[PDB]
């Protein structure tokens, strides 16, 4: 008996967000859950890992109820309808009836009872921009399908008052810290699965907006008023990353981010397609870059850098270095090195908020 009227654009906005998480084994998983309670329409999409909820206030008289309908089909019908049209939606004999202007649609349904949180340990509000920065500055370093399952995601840590993101695949690490002034009384850690965290970052579009965060023992919740995002957590312990951060780095290199990125990209063309190895030769004011492949093709480049100290010959995966440079927001970049067998520490020119660790390759 569920029935409501809605403007095309009012339905389209939450429908597009929700359909984005809809990808399926169970047939109901391909469906969007529609719930009319009073003058509110709720739209829910899930893949069992993440759940996204969109909400719309209904203007004209609406009859309550709940149903599930093919998410992609309803979104495509909504998108294809003329701009600003009023859509009439009703449930009739296990079918969804859609009317808009001279267009009529009948969709198959699945019962809402078949559609598939968690006390909060910590809850705080944060700028969408600050949370998105933490994810976007580190997400490239997360492992993908590593047997060490706890690496296939991002650590979100609250400590002191600081919110920190940590991502690693065992070869390289990315970390970003922001003083959000969150009272915690203890260090709190959560591992958000890779698919979930990447979805969340894409949802954080409000440059001026705020997001309410709830950290639970097995879930994370992000609320913006227009949407509620819920993700299950990776049930494991994140490695002791503090133990792998290089501390005694004696070789400080200051270089131009663009010059280094351009030289690494040029040399990468002639590096091994699988191993992506490049050789770095550091000396006073100079960085020599060399790359070669099995066909004996070779690329060489010399980059002027701010460096005074002893020589260093070190091997690196060029893609790992390019990944780091792609997230450095300053014109200059700091590389802190020691020996050929030890990690490179990378920072922005003017702050230590972001830190990148890259293990070398044997030459």
């Amino acid at each position: 008996h569920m029935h409501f009227t809605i403007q095309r654009e009012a339905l389209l906005k939450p429908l597009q967000l929700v359909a984005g998480v809809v990808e399926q084994t169970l047939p109901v998983l391909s469906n969007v859950l529609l719930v009319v309670e009073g003058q509110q329409l709720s739209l829910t999409g899930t893949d069992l890992e993440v759940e996204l909820v969109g909400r719309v206030v209904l203007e004209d008289a609406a009859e309550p109820g709940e149903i599930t309908v093919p998410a992609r089909k309803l979104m495509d019908i909504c998108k294809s309808l003329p701009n600003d049209v009023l859509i009439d939606i009703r449930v009739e004999e296990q079918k969804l009836l859609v009317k808009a202007g001279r267009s009529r649609f009948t969709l198959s349904t699945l019962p809402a009872n078949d559609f598939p949180e968690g006390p909060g340990s910590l809850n705080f509000s944060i700028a969408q921009s600050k949370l998105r920065r933490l994810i976007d500055r580190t997400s490239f370093a997360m492992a993908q399908q590593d047997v060490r399952y706890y690496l296939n995601g991002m650590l979100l840590e609250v400590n002191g008052g600081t919110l920190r993101s940590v991502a690693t695949d065992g070869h390289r690490l990315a970390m970003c810290s922001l003083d959000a002034q969150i009272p915690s009384q203890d260090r709190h850690q959560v591992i958000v699965p890779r698919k979930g965290i990447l979805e969340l970052a894409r949802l954080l579009t409000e440059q001026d907006g705020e997001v309410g965060i709830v950290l639970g023992q097995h879930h994370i919740r992000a609320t913006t008023g227009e949407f509620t995002f819920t993700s299950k957590l990776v049930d494991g312990k994140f490695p002791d990353y503090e133990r792998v951060l290089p501390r005694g780095g004696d070789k400080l290199v200051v270089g131009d981010r663009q010059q280094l990125r351009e030289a690494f990209s040029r040399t990468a063309i002639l590096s091994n397609e699988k191993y992506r190895g490049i050789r770095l030769q550091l000396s006073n004011g100079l960085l020599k870059i060399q790359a070669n492949n099995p066909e004996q093709e070779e690329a060489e480049e010399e980059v002027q850098v701010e460096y005074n100290g002893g020589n260093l010959e070190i091997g690196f995966n060029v893609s790992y270095l390019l990944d780091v440079l792609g997230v450095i927001g300053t014109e200059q970049v700091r590389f802190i090195l020691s020996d050929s067998n030890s990690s490179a520490l990378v920072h922005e020119a003017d702050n230590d908020d972001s830190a990148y660790v890259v293990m070398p390759m044997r030459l």
Partner: peptide, 5 residues
């Protein structure tokens, strides 16, 4: 390639 752990 070397490992962090």
């Amino acid at each position: 390639q070397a490992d962090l752990f």
